[PDB]
Amino acid sequence: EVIASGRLEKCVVDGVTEELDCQEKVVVTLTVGNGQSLQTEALEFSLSCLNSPDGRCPCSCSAADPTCACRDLAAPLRVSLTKSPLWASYPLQYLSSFNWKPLEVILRPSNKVCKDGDWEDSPTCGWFSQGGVRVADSQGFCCECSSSQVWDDTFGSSKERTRANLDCDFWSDPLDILIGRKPVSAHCLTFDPQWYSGYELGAASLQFEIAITVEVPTAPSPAPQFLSPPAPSTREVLHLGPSVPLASSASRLLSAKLLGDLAMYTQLPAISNQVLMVPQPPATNRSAWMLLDKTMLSMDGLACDKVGTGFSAFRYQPSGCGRAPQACLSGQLKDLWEADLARIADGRVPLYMITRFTGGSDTTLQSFSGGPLSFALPVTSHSQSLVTLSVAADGVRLVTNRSPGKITGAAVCRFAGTSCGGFEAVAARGYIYVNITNTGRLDSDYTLTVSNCSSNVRPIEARTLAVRAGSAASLDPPMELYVEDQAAAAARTCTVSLYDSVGAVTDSLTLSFYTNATQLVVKPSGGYN
Amino acid sequence: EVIASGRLEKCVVDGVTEELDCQEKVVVTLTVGNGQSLQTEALEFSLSCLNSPDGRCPCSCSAADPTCACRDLAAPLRVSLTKSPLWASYPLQYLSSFNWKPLEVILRPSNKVCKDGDWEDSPTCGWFSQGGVRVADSQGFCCECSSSQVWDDTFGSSKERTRANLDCDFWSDPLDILIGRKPVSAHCLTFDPQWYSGYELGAASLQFEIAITVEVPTAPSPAPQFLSPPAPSTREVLHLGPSVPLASSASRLLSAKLLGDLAMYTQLPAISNQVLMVPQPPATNRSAWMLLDKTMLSMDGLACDKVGTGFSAFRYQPSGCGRAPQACLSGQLKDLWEADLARIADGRVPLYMITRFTGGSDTTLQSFSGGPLSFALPVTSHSQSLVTLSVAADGVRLVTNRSPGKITGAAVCRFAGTSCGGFEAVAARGYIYVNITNTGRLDSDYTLTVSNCSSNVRPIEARTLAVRAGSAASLDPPMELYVEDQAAAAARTCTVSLYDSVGAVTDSLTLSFYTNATQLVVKPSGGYN
Amino acid sequence: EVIASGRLEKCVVDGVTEELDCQEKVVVTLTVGNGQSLQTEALEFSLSCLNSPDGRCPCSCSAADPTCACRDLAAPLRVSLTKSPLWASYPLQYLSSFNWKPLEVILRPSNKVCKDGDWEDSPTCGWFSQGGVRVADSQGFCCECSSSQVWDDTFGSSKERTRANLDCDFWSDPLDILIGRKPVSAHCLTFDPQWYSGYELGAASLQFEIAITVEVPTAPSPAPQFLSPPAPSTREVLHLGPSVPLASSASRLLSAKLLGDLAMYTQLPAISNQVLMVPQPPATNRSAWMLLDKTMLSMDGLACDKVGTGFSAFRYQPSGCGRAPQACLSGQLKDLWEADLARIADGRVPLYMITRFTGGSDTTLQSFSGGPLSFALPVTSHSQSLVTLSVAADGVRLVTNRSPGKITGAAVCRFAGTSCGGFEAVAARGYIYVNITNTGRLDSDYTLTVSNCSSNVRPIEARTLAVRAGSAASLDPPMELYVEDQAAAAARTCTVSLYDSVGAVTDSLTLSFYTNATQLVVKPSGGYN
Ligand SMILES: *[C@@H]1O[C@H](CO[C@@H]2O[C@@H](C)[C@@H](O)[C@@H](O)[C@@H]2O)[C@@H](O[C@@H]2O[C@H](CO)[C@@H](O[C@H]3O[C@H](CO)[C@@H](O)[C@H](O)[C@@H]3O)[C@H](O)[C@H]2NC(C)=O)[C@H](O)[C@H]1NC(C)=O
Ligand SMILES: *[C@@H]1O[C@H](CO[C@@H]2O[C@@H](C)[C@@H](O)[C@@H](O)[C@@H]2O)[C@@H](O[C@@H]2O[C@H](CO)[C@@H](O[C@H]3O[C@H](CO)[C@@H](O)[C@H](O)[C@@H]3O)[C@H](O)[C@H]2NC(C)=O)[C@H](O)[C@H]1NC(C)=O
Ligand SMILES: *[C@@H]1O[C@H](CO[C@@H]2O[C@@H](C)[C@@H](O)[C@@H](O)[C@@H]2O)[C@@H](O[C@@H]2O[C@H](CO)[C@@H](O[C@H]3O[C@H](CO)[C@@H](O)[C@H](O)[C@@H]3O)[C@H](O)[C@H]2NC(C)=O)[C@H](O)[C@H]1NC(C)=O
Ligand SMILES: *[C@@H]1O[C@H](CO)[C@@H](O[C@@H]2O[C@H](CO)[C@@H](O)[C@H](O)[C@H]2NC(C)=O)[C@H](O)[C@H]1NC(C)=O
Ligand SMILES: *[C@@H]1O[C@H](CO)[C@@H](O[C@@H]2O[C@H](CO)[C@@H](O)[C@H](O)[C@H]2NC(C)=O)[C@H](O)[C@H]1NC(C)=O
Ligand SMILES: *[C@@H]1O[C@H](CO)[C@@H](O[C@@H]2O[C@H](CO)[C@@H](O)[C@H](O)[C@H]2NC(C)=O)[C@H](O)[C@H]1NC(C)=O
Ligand SMILES: *[C@@H]1O[C@H](CO)[C@@H](O)[C@H](O)[C@H]1NC(C)=O
Ligand SMILES: *[C@@H]1O[C@H](CO)[C@@H](O)[C@H](O)[C@H]1NC(C)=O
Ligand SMILES: *[C@@H]1O[C@H](CO)[C@@H](O)[C@H](O)[C@H]1NC(C)=O
Ligand SMILES: *[C@@H]1O[C@H](CO)[C@@H](O)[C@H](O)[C@H]1NC(C)=O
Ligand SMILES: *[C@@H]1O[C@H](CO)[C@@H](O)[C@H](O)[C@H]1NC(C)=O
Ligand SMILES: *[C@@H]1O[C@H](CO)[C@@H](O)[C@H](O)[C@H]1NC(C)=O
């Protein structure tokens, strides 16, 4: 869209010669939208003379002169603008390394010998080391049959749990028990061969590039009106972005400036301060990657049932010998990954996997240019770039292509396309997949809107689509759909509208979806009454 | 405010017929402010002919023809714009269910029998179940008199604490103690009848609707100058918003586009990733609702003194029998709610209640259109919407109403209006309540500014107010006021200015407030010296 | 940059007299950039008459009249705009007080007497109090030689750790051990004399002030063209900002409006909800200040190895007597500060110190106007302010100064300038320090860009610099530089470009830097195999 278009006398005072150079320019301010991938509209700046060196018309030299390229002839300077896919890239800062799944190994020594002392040189589990220095509390812990447990197991069965499932019965091995050598167990902390590096994510940065194609005419162009045959011209592509928000033509006929983007209506996911878990090595494979909130972790390794739970946490756990094997070792990377695989299967969105933003596919993040240790997300909310073009021309006009369209498909699917037709209310979300077609002979821009929805359907923001002539396109990633009630519904409705480049509806369709009632965490029953 | 206003030749190349249709349009870009609730200003687009089908003037048909509605007559196309209240709505995703207040029930069996075994079929507290399966560690724990405690209580008094306050004295019941049946206690975990559903909040989305009222003239209008009598016209309201950022007139004389909003000077509260606690059922009542940081919770129920503390945390607590009743069960939803009620009474802002954003009132969130399971907040920071109007007219002019105003009241009050006159420095904030009056005969826009403040008073952002003719208005929600020093002050000052629609001060007033010194957490005294 | 420039008929309907006052104005919308500190460009509004009271030309009174100041003469109204340094200020809300370093004092009483009872009136460590009330669990804990430990230490050496390093050997003191008086120890929790106040940070607010200098002419001004000698004029400075986004001239020839800023390409650090640790007292000294994530803290004091770990956490720690002295007391403010000093020395960025945002210097935050209890950060991402000027003039022109420049230095340094030449890949970041010079006779604006970088170098956003004539300037704070691979590289490259005010490169330079391989946390080796 064109914000402003008009004439301005722009003067420049030279820094070294103090001389003032004034020239009237056509100043255009326009927006370069998020999904503006095709050259579907152009700005035609009218020039009163061609091949002007200084940009000033009329010609100061004679056409009879072979060294005078300037011709007092009219032709338009055609300027089109596109934007590359927009990404929110988060800088990584390495914190620590985390094991996939620390595992407890239980030893039941035949000789009934168990050594877990802090000053023990030869313990049952052995010691761990770090650069030749012995790691504190890495020797594990020992457990033995309680005198009460031996009594209960001999004359019946002990109701108290033993971590290693020891048989405390006197008759299980009476010779050793009699002389004090009661059944014993060793509890060693071992690590999975797979380790993960943890990187804290910084603040998002919008990353894109705007390409301005400038067709500079060298000669003029050779009841229903049609577009004039193109003038012999010289193409030139200029690039703008947050890194380089400035650019000028070689002729310096055109000068562009990236002012900045307007604010996004839907904020970016709050993932700064989270810890990105990347697999340690034995194109970038972000499939196994996870992004975890700091509450899910134990940085110092001193806390149980957390990502990073270490030797001290495991060794000194309250009533450790009376707990079940692998207690203290829940909520590890392997557990969380598996809990998420379970969630996807239940039509729910993962909490830890990095695909919880894309909507299922790992393939969408792959198209990102960043290095092996980079993380970014596709931006779907509109982020309108204000660009200001300053041209040495008489005037300007806007020439927009308007091809009609048709919605060829629309469905509400679950995460990772588990099933289409609807999703679980409030405990899950749906994904609006839409297939559209350009039914014209020209590349054109379109707007997909979801509105006039049934009760308690969260508003969905619109989507921009640049579709090639006669070609088919789809929304990637799809639109997120949430309901604001926990009830089961057979046919919740929404109108899916397809607007052309001029703001007229070319196609409309009613999208129907079901919701399954929210499956709340089931309350425990019983206890003291 | 009007950013740009000028003429642009806009051409459209038809997608199927390839024919070019050019027409010069008046292009206006303007801002639609946050508190723009009334039609206080209009854009008058001058038309050289009325009832034109194609929007093109002059008339291509004869006035003598009954099927020709077009008249070569002048009249303005009046266009006014308003914005509905702006909301930041956060999508809910169900995580788990949390009890209001888990309660410990202490049993002191007469028969001195206590069973807390892991494999015990009939324990003292009984078992809890989930879908017929027995819940692990839900049988509670048992405590008994230490042999040392029986000795101390017999020959004096035990200085060691017992959880159930057992009388370990031999003479309390000598017959049972003699035969080994020492006093015993059972500690059962029970749950309050009230449960709460926990929903993780997603990213904010700005939600509003812009209404453009278009008065299309059908006939012309029938030293101090006055406004011309209105021309016989046909009203039409068009709507723009993040969902539908496009709109055109039925006549397609006017075409609107929502470009997006500028960034807000004061960021939205960082409440994404927090867990919204909604009461489980036995208009939407968000009064009892709470919003909690993940650090306040124990999702897996394995950690003590957290929202979600469960059976394992309670059963295996270090020196559990030597702690006070209800240990491990602090910091529950009931405790936090009560700690917040306490805070409000002390002139402090709640940390967990969802009213900690509004400034006291539960009534402000009630005016939100969302479903029973929706959460949103009123936006008070300016969020300026850029709208671009493209009209088939000769020119345009802006007609703004300028009614004078007066500040009829201004006070600094505490949270939930506890008391007015001031607040506690740094540990609390104040709320600037302002009452203004339109002292003119026309609906008008105003700006309330708080500036020229005394030392260490945090800058307050301005506020837009559209007030009806002769009517009274107030700031809702009020302005937040913070000080940057911890000292007690009798009369800290600020200038409250009321600007008219033209940028001239109609009323000014000096607002005075006190601050009570920051009441810091009192340090413990004593211990080893 | 100038967005729009054109004429608009602006009408005002008086609220009390209902009379319409129309006047055609020149409406200019422009951007006021982040580093726009100097008056390097001006807008010249052409006036057809001078000293007009109503702003309307031509003169309604005779020049022959002594009480008629109006002269039908031409002169420009010169308007320049600057912006003060931009800050993101976070409101403080006091939560609690935290000790610098709680310390454990170990007592080994000669008389072998240790009292740690909950109902004990005279315990070994003594009690702590709060307003005369005894603080629960503040009496510490007692430890004694295990009967097994006495046996092992007598007939060899005990392999089990004792917290106070007790000699459990019978022969160490046989008289007392024989009669049951085994070696005992007391473990008292003491506090460092230094305490810190913890303040929760609220949401960021952009804070700046735009100064518009208006030179109102009173009389007219007295082949290579030069700038006309200045017209006798009267200077006037107007101020805009989030608090007061409105302003008008005394002549009301000029009327300004702050529309708002465009969104920043690089989001502000996610520091809301974090706890700012300010030293308690015995210009503002923010050197010792720290900003901590809530996961680093124990608000209720019930959890070990956290900022806020208190008496209960310390008293009831699992196997407390078998742990090393000061266990439970790790991760305190003193520890974190020291771990950060260690990080800076290793070329790494601190995690807790508030200098982790500036890039090393404490001096950058000092230039902030806020009170003793205020926190703010310098904004380096562009934040473009849209300003709309509405002037009673015939037309306008833009006069920009263009002085050439040169890059006099460029280096990649570590945090706090540890060493220049490069940094540690992914585990650290580099800081691009750039020194530029204005080689002209006029104050001018410039753009520093970092682009055409070697593989896996994170894109750096551009930087605006207003440099005085003939003067030297540098980027403060410096540019952050991250790599997207963990490899060691000798010469990673980037082009540092210096653009003049017109968008032409005046100087270019290639910046070379090394990266040291990411030093990952070393995995423990050993344990059970
Ligand atoms: C989520 O809900 C879907 C639909 O919602 C509910 O539909 C009814 C079952 C009814 O209870 C209504 O009030 C709800 O709104 C569930 O999908 C339905 O699944 C049915 C069983 O699989 C299916 O049925 C018939 O299926 C075929 C014909 O299609 C027959 O061969 C068969 O014998 C059944 O009669 C029904 O058509 C289907 N409905 C839709 C709209 O797809 C869905 O299973 C549920 N999800 C989960 C995981 O529970
Ligand atoms: C917060 O501070 C308020 C005012 O600040 C302080 O005012 C003085 C007490 C003095 O110490 C000064 O240096 C401070 O700035 C407190 O309000 C004050 O409360 C007083 C006692 O209630 C009150 O007094 C008189 O009140 C009436 C007359 O108004 C008499 O009948 C009575 O006998 C007292 O003489 C005083 O007027 C009032 N001041 C104001 C400005 O309202 C406020 O209590 C305090 N809040 C808390 C919770 O401590
Ligand atoms: C981070 O890396 C810097 C450079 O990277 C590496 O340089 C080589 C050592 C080589 O391994 C290459 O593949 C890497 O890219 C380290 O800086 C280097 O440090 C060397 C030893 O201090 C130094 O060498 C010579 O230094 C002087 C001459 O300058 C001689 O007197 C001396 O005898 C050595 O021969 C080398 O020049 C220097 N390189 C650069 C580019 O500065 C840096 O130490 C390292 N940082 C850490 C903390 O490990
Ligand atoms: C959008 O169009 C694609 C086809 O271009 C649809 O995908 C096909 O779906 C059928 C039936 O499930 C499969 O047999 C094909 O293998 C699919 N092709 C591809 C390339 O995936 C898709 O379902 C359409 N989406 C909507 C919402 O209508
Ligand atoms: C703004 O005006 C309202 C009245 O319209 C004031 O509220 C009244 O205050 C008096 C005195 O406390 C009460 O008796 C009334 O019941 C209140 N009315 C309502 C509707 O609340 C209010 O105090 C004024 N605010 C300021 C800051 O001056
Ligand atoms: C930018 O210029 C300053 C000088 O104005 C440089 O700083 C000096 O560096 C030398 C050598 O290290 C020291 O002897 C001086 O004491 C420094 N002066 C000051 C004021 O710090 C600085 O190194 C230059 N930076 C770059 C990147 O070239
Ligand atoms: C990514 O990594 C996993 C690791 O198990 C592997 O199975 C997969 O094939 C890899 N490649 C892709 C493209 O997913
Ligand atoms: C209202 O919604 C229904 C579908 O629910 C649709 O048929 C209709 O066209 C919509 N009307 C408007 C005015 O949006
Ligand atoms: C909201 O819920 C509470 C629950 O106790 C009830 O007391 C109250 O009356 C309800 N209604 C309103 C409007 O607050
Ligand atoms: C300065 O502040 C005082 C009130 O503290 C006010 O009376 C005065 O009008 C203000 N002046 C300006 C120029 O803002
Ligand atoms: C700030 O505080 C520290 C406290 O130890 C002190 O050493 C320092 O000199 C103070 N001043 C400055 C300007 O750093
Ligand atoms: C490409 O980068 C190199 C430095 O790496 C530089 O010399 C060259 O000028 C750059 N070219 C462009 C077109 O940016």
Residue numbers in the entry:
A (entry chain A), B (entry chain A), C (entry chain A): 23 to 244, 271 to 330, 345 to 591
Provide passages from the article that reported this PDB entry:
The cellular fusion protein HAP2, which is structurally homologous to viral class II fusion proteins, drives gamete fusion across several eukaryotic kingdoms. HAP2/GCS1 is the first bona fide gamete fusion protein identified. The presence of HAP2 in organisms across the main branches of eukaryotes (Cole et al., 2014, Ebchuqin et al., 2014, Kawai-Toyooka et al., 2014, Steele and Dana, 2009) suggests that it is likely an ancestral gamete fusogen already present at the origin of eukaryotic life. The reported HAP2 structure displayed the three characteristic β sheet-rich domains of viral class II fusion proteins, organized around the central domain I. In the post-fusion form, domain I is a 10-stranded β sandwich with the inner A0B0I0H0G0 β sheet packing against the outer J0C0D0E0F0 β sheet.
Here, we report the X-ray structure of the C. reinhardtii HAP2 ectodomain derived from a different crystal form that resolves most of the regions that were missing in the previous structure. The complex with the single-chain variable fragment (scFv) of one of these antibodies resulted in crystals in the hexagonal space group P6322 diffracting to 2.6 Å resolution. In total, the new model contains 551 out of 573 residues, with a break of about 15 residues in the fg loop in domain II—a loop projecting laterally, perpendicular to the trimer axis and roughly midway between top and bottom. The three “fusion helices” are arranged into a horseshoe shape, exposing the non-polar residues toward the target membrane. αF1 is 9 aa long and exposes residues W173 and F177; ηF is only one turn and exposes F192 and W193, and αF2 is 7 aa long and exposes P196, L197, L200, and I201. Mutagenesis altering the non-polar character of the exposed residues in the fusion helices disrupted the ability of the HAP2 ectodomain to insert into liposomes. The 37-residue long C0D0 loop is completely resolved in the new structure, and displays a CLL motif with three parallel disulfide bonds. Although the new crystals did not entirely resolve the E0F0 loop, they showed density for its N-terminal six amino acids (aa) (sequence PTAPSP, downstream of strand E0) as well as its C-terminal 14 residues (271-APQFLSPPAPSTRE-285) preceding β strand F0, accounting in total for 40% of the loop. The new structure resolves the N-terminal 12 residues of the stem, showing that it is directed toward the tip of domain II of the adjacent “left” subunit in the trimer. The HAP2 stem fills a surface groove in the adjacent protomer, formed between the bc loop and the aefg β sheet of domain II. The packing between HAP2 trimers in the new crystals involves 2-fold symmetric head-to-head interactions along the 3-fold crystallographic axis.
